[PDB]
Design a protein around this ligand. Structure first.
Ligand SMILES: [Mg+2]
Ligand SMILES: [Mg+2]
Ligand SMILES: [Mg+2]
Ligand SMILES: [Mg+2]
Ligand SMILES: [Mg+2]
Ligand SMILES: [Mg+2]
Ligand SMILES: [Mg+2]
Ligand SMILES: [Mg+2]
Ligand SMILES: [Mg+2]
Ligand SMILES: [Mg+2]
Ligand SMILES: [Mg+2]
Ligand SMILES: [Mg+2]
Lengths: 168, 63, 209, 258, 160
RNA sequence: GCGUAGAGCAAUGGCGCGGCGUCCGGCGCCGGCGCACCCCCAAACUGCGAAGCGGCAGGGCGCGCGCAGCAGCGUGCGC
RNA sequence: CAGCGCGGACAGAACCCGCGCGUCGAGCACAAGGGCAAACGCCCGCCUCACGGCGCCCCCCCGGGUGCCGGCGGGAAACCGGG
RNA sequence: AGCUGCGGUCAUAUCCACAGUAGAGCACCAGAACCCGUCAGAUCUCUGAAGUUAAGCCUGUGAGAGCCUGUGGAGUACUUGGGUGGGCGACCACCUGGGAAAUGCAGGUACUGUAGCUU
């Protein structure tokens, strides 16, 4: 069929909400430097929550976005942790899916005890070519329903592209 | 002591005894005009039938 | 301790509801606006009788409760607790004030919230009972026990409408046979040719008959 | 879900804003004239870049709509030898050069000339943007616009503008050097990315002379070549026709029956 | 007793119409204005600068002065037994070119043209007054294909 | 130009019951919540909006020539 | 933007991130009203028009509007700025 | 006839759903040495033309939601003016003019300026 409807990885977003500032965060954004190869972004806490110990505007999390084929090697390494097996409900309504690994050294990273151990959320965004019509500056419009990815078309893509196994 | 605060009673009747007089007609005034426009209009009136180049040929530099 | 209702009879003031500007008004003693078998379907009580105000005045919330109890006790004792559904139409939304004045007199005269009244017009229904046709005379009698609690003149009217829908009994019967009615409990929706046709066929699916 | 009161109370934006085509705050400040001038609506050089071509227009606002004074397209650069890279920086410069020499050859030189103003539209005003290449092309063709050269390459100060480092951007010497080294180090990647360059026969060493020769021919003969394009009512059968009201009713009554 | 700010009591006067909010369209910038032309001040409340007083929001006045962004307008106001001429400065977003003399100008330019042309051919036209609605004309309504219909009072019935 | 009477619950803010539910809780029912219809409404609510009022116009125009430092190809002002 | 929806290790009612929707229900020091969505809100850069001298208007003032000649800031510019 | 640039009207244009579109245009799209801008060449910026009409754009469809127009509601509601009309009042009736709104119902889903391009 048509080559322009083919589903790709549009971007992969990683974040580790370590929950507090200090050296554990500054080591955690060094981990996203190791994985992505990019300089990550720090997340600020939106409110001050007594139960979690966070303050408003406190640097709480570290996040990054990786694209291209560089996002694919981060993904299949992260999918080798989860045996390429993801729950059906973990796929989003809008065509994405996500999972979270518990230690980053399952990605092919040596330990480095001065850094530590962090878990992270891998958020996969899928698209067909033609997403630019919703993201560009001039003549911005909605992408059509045929070109939007459903949850099931993301599920069909996940079993076809990665030899995936759905759950439940 | 406490008495009446306000009324407009008999005011329209008072205001129409000598009528509501119009704005009294006057000579046209330069009050409120644009200053760059008014400056230029007076320059056109100063050199009305004789041009500026002929005027400064007579009276020298007019500024 | 309550003033007589002749002091707050007529709609003298602009309507003055409980709002952010008028707070501290107590709750009305008229608590219930639907009596009898409220859950009864639209096609069970064809007859409709109304107590209609022939006055422009303010019905007290106290009189609205007293006429409620007078009419509800009669429909229970004579028609029975299942054979009617009586709805109180007017709601006591207007707040009346009392000056209550050492004795200040007329200085600072604007009054505190004193009670709640419902403001009715000429021809406005106050109460309405939906019954079977056998209990016409019962329902006419319960409303004349209600209008004793009310100031001024009221009129009991037997309406040709079917129950609490606006549709007349001849016109309601026809559309019920046509399949054009979807019940909403006390009232009804008439099925029209305006939807999408897949939605129209779901509308005939949920019709009454 | 969204309630019905949403749609009934929804006030749509202006159609060219819903289309994402005009910045009406920017458009308001751009075409604004002093009330002292009353009729003299300002001319504006509007530069628009598409995927294929670069549009340059001098046009003036009226009540019914803007009236075009002059037009040039980068597709018109084929007469001047430029058939390659129709949306690059130099095609932007040459198209800006083309309206400026069209508009000056249109009006005769007895009275003073009005100032024109640059209309980027919704493109970003960056240093090295093509929309300012069309600005710089228009000033070289004699169109008087109250510019400053801060966003054209070669700028170091308001008094000092380096024409030489402007010229290697302009004459493709930055492009040809990139085009030349790709041809040596990755000849097959050179074969794929510059396909219409090879089919045109363009060579990167030849590329400066093509642009320099084009700039003379624009300034010598900027005159518009016209195409008549007489009849296109053949294309009328390609459009579809609407149904009638009773035919819409006939499909609806049929849809009820099945 | 109400407070006397510059926009007092303008909750409805300085509002926008339903589904007609927003900044003004750029087409207002293509309107000409001339000295002597009548304009209607109607305030655009989206434009906060150059807003006239609320008193002039219904009023129509003649332009005396034209500025860079604004317009001076002569508007008379009753101060007791006199009309006092106020000079109203308003941005152009708050005015409209008035159609008060719209039909007079249409009448005048045609009639002055017809008087010029008749004077050219040696004729003259006496008076071109607007004739008002006079008496009714005589009518002939034939009962051919139009039979008279009786109107009767009908018995009062009431529906309930 | 207005936003009163009326009208309207469509947004804001209230009032009240039913109806519906691949919603939640409790033990089919009850209670929440959601939706659609509906109900009673508003001096400090308005998708509408009168009667009634307010402003302004019903006279100078057309043409031509001069002038300007304004303007950039007009606008004013003189005749 | 408020808010909603659906996804995501620890992670919970409430940490963060993503995608989708979202007529303004958010925000604009504050009272209320009006206003406002490629903004009048948010963020960032550069700034200090929160300026001098002459006027005029709305007009008791207060406050605001509008010009002219200078001096500037931002911007590629039109423009905008006299808190 | 259409597309496109710039517009005018600012929903008959919005919103949902499903269809179809030869040409050219508009696009999506290929890429990132440079200018430029980012966490990320996603956007912006530059360079390209290998692919593709899948989307956008366009058009059609829908007893679609809304919106628009007509009609109706209705001479109804309300009201200017008048009476030594009525009524204990509340207020009502009459006379003379003016005269609505919501629901309903029917049809409509765009017009247009300028410029360029398309057989
Ligand atoms: Mg007593
Ligand atoms: Mg009173
Ligand atoms: Mg801009
Ligand atoms: Mg201000
Ligand atoms: Mg009101
Ligand atoms: Mg009312
Ligand atoms: Mg708000
Ligand atoms: Mg102030
Ligand atoms: Mg100021
Ligand atoms: Mg419809
Ligand atoms: Mg009398
Ligand atoms: Mg349609």
């Amino acid at each position: 069929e048509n080559p322009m409807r083919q589903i790709r990885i549009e971007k992969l977003c990683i974040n580790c909400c370590v929950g507090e500032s200090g050296e554990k965060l500054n080591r955690a954004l060094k981990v996203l430097e190791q994985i992505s190869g990019q300089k990550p972004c720090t997340g600020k806490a939106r409110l001050t929550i007594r139960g979690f110990g966070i303050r408003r505007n406190e640097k709480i999390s570290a996040y990054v976005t990786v694209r291209g084929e560089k996002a694919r090697e981060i993904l299949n390494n992260a999918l080798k942790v989860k045996e390429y097996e993801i729950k059906k409900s973990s796929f989003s309504n809008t065509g994405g899916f996500g999972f979270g690994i518990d230690e980053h050294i399952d990605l092919g990273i040596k330990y480095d005890p001065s850094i530590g151990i962090y878990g992270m959320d891998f958020i996969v965004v899928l698209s067909r070519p033609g997403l630019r019509v919703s993201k560009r500056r001039i003549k911005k419009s909605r992408v059509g329903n045929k070109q939007r990815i459903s949850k099931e078309e993301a599920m069909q893509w996940f079993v076809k592209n990665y030899d995936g196994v759905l759950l439940n | 002591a406490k008495r009446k605060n306000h009324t407009n009673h008999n005011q329209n009747r008072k205001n129409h005894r000598n009528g509501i007089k119009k704005v009294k007609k006057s000579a046209p005034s330069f009050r409120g005009l644009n200053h760059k426009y008014l400056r230029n209009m007076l320059y056109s009136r100063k050199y009305n039938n004789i041009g500026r180049a002929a005027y400064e040929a007579e009276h020298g530099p007019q500024q | 301790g309550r003033r007589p209702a002749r002091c707050y009879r007529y709609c003298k003031n602009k309507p003055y509801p409980k709002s952010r500007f008028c707070r501290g008004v107590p709750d009305p003693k008229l608590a219930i606006y639907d009596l009898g078998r409220k859950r009864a379907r639209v096609t069970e009580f064809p007859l409709s009788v109304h107590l209609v105000s022939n006055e422009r005045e303010q019905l007290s919330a106290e009189a609205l409760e007293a006429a409620r109890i007078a009419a509800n006790r009669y429909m229970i004792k004579h028609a029975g607790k299942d054979n009617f559904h009586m709805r109180i139409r007017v709601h006591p939304l207007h707040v009346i004030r009392i000056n209550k004045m050492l004795q200040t007199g007329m200085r600072g005269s604007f009054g505190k919230p004193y009670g709640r009244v419902a403001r009715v017009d000429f021809g406005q229904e106050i109460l309405s009972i939906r019954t079977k046709d056998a209990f016409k005379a019962v329902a006419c009698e319960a409303l004349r026990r209600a209008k004793a609690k009310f100031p001024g003149h009221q009129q009991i009217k037997v309406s040709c409408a079917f129950g609490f829908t606006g549709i007349s009994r001849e016109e309601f019967e026809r559309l019920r046979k046509e399949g054009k009615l979807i019940s909403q409990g006390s009232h009804v929706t008439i099925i029209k040719e305006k939807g999408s046709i897949v939605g129209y066929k779901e509308k005939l699916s949920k019709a009454i008959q | 879900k969204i309630k019905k009161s949403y749609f009934s109370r929804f006030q749509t934006k202006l159609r060219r804003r819903r289309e994402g085509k005009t910045d009406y705050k920017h458009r308001y400040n751009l075409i604004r004239q002093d009330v002292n001038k009353h009729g003299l609506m300002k001319i504006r050089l509007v530069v628009r870049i598409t995927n294929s071509r670069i549009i340059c227009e001098i046009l003036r606002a009226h009540v019914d709509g803007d009236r075009s004074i002059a037009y040039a397209d980068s597709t018109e650069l084929k007469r001047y030898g430029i058939t390659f890279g129709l949306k690059n920086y130099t095609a932007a410069y040459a198209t800006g050069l083309l309206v400026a020499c069209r508009y000056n050859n249109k009006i005769a030189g007895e009275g003073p000339r009005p100032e024109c103003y640059l209309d980027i539209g919704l493109r970003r005003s960056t240093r090295g943007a093509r929309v300012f290449g069309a600005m710089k092309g228009a000033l070289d063709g004699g169109l008087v616009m109250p510019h400053s050269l801060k966003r054209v390459p070669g700028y170091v100060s308001e008094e000092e503008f380096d024409s030489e480092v402007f010229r290697n951007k302009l004459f493709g010497k930055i492009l040809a050097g990139y085009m030349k080294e790709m041809m040596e180090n990755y000849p097959e990647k050179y074969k794929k990315t510059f396909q219409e360059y090879i089919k045109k026969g363009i060579n990167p060493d030849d590329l400066e002379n093509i642009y320099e020769n084009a700039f003379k021919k624009i300034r010598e003969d900027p005159s518009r070549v016209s195409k008549t394009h007489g009849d296109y009512s053949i294309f009328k059968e390609f459009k579809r026709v609407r149904l009638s009201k009773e035919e819409r009713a006939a499909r609806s009554r049929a849809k009820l029956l099945d | 007793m109400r407070s006397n700010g510059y926009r007092r009591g303008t909750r409805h006067r300085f509002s926008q119409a339903f589904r007609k909010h927003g900044m003004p369209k750029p087409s207002i910038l293509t309107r000409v204005f001339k000295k002597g032309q009548y304009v209607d001040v109607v305030v655009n409340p989206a434009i906060h600068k150059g807003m006239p007083h609320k008193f002039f929001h219904g009023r129509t006045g003649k332009i005396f002065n034209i500025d860079k962004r604004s317009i001076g307008i002569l508007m008379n106001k009753r101060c007791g037994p006199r009309y006092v001429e106020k000079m109203v400065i308003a941005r152009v977003e708050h005015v409209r070119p008035s159609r008060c003399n719209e039909e007079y100008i249409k009448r005048r330019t045609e009639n002055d043209r017809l008087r010029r042309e008749a004077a050219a051919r040696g004729e003259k036209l006496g008076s071109l007054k607007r004739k008002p609605g006079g008496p009714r004309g005589a009518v002939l309504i034939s009962t051919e294909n139009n039979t008279p219909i009786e109107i009767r009072n009908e018995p009062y019935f009431e529906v309930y």
